[PDB]
Design a protein around this ligand. Sequence first.
Ligand SMILES: Nc1ccc(S(=O)(=O)N(Cc2ccccc2)[C@H]2CNC[C@@H]2N(Cc2ccccc2)S(=O)(=O)c2ccc(N)cc2)cc1
Ligand SMILES: [Cl-]
Lengths: 99, 99
Amino acid sequence: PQITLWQRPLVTIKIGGQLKEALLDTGADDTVLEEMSLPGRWKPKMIGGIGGFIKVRQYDQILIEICGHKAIGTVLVGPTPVNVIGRNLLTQIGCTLNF
Amino acid sequence: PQITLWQRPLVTIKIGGQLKEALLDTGADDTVLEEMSLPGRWKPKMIGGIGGFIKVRQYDQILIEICGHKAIGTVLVGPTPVNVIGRNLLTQIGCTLNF
Ligand SMILES: Nc1ccc(S(=O)(=O)N(Cc2ccccc2)[C@H]2CNC[C@@H]2N(Cc2ccccc2)S(=O)(=O)c2ccc(N)cc2)cc1
Ligand SMILES: [Cl-]
């Protein structure tokens, strides 16, 4: 698909058996989602932007489906105001910026 | 161009006759640049980042070149972690996401 930026590029994802909406975000180094349970080990991390930093839990090697694409990656889980798909997983689906 | 996401999509921009590095950010609705001088009057704007909402200065109809492409639009100025080119100007340069 070619996705326009007239509007936020929102997509549906499946993770931990759950369907969530998330923003395809080239400015995000990492994928970050609102509070949820994920299997496996995790470690704490801090991520920041305008407004400051939040604490998240870093889960590695998590399977996600994004637009029919199956991908594997790191997911940060915490009190974020917006679910985003970051570069770590956009690369895995072959996503590029084009102009 | 076609820009992959293994590394941050940083490009060169020109504004006020100066070259700066900025991040192409499909998660940012709006372009926000580091503190700088711009002509004209500005208006208040609130923008929401991961740590919360902050006040920034809004300048409209500003000339800005992004990776060689000419744009004229709204440029926000404030304590952003990095210069980000948001959807308002990525649309102007004809940028899309593709996979
Ligand atoms: N590692 C890492 C660091 C930060 C984040 S993020 O701040 O949540 N995040 C997602 C987001 C926030 C708010 C609204 C919509 C999307 C970043 C990335 N896309 C926009 C946002 N930001 C730009 C950024 C932040 C840190 C490093 C490099 C760039 S931001 O400063 O919150 C921001 C928000 C809105 C606008 N107009 C401009 C900027 C995610 C992963
Ligand atoms: Cl590639």
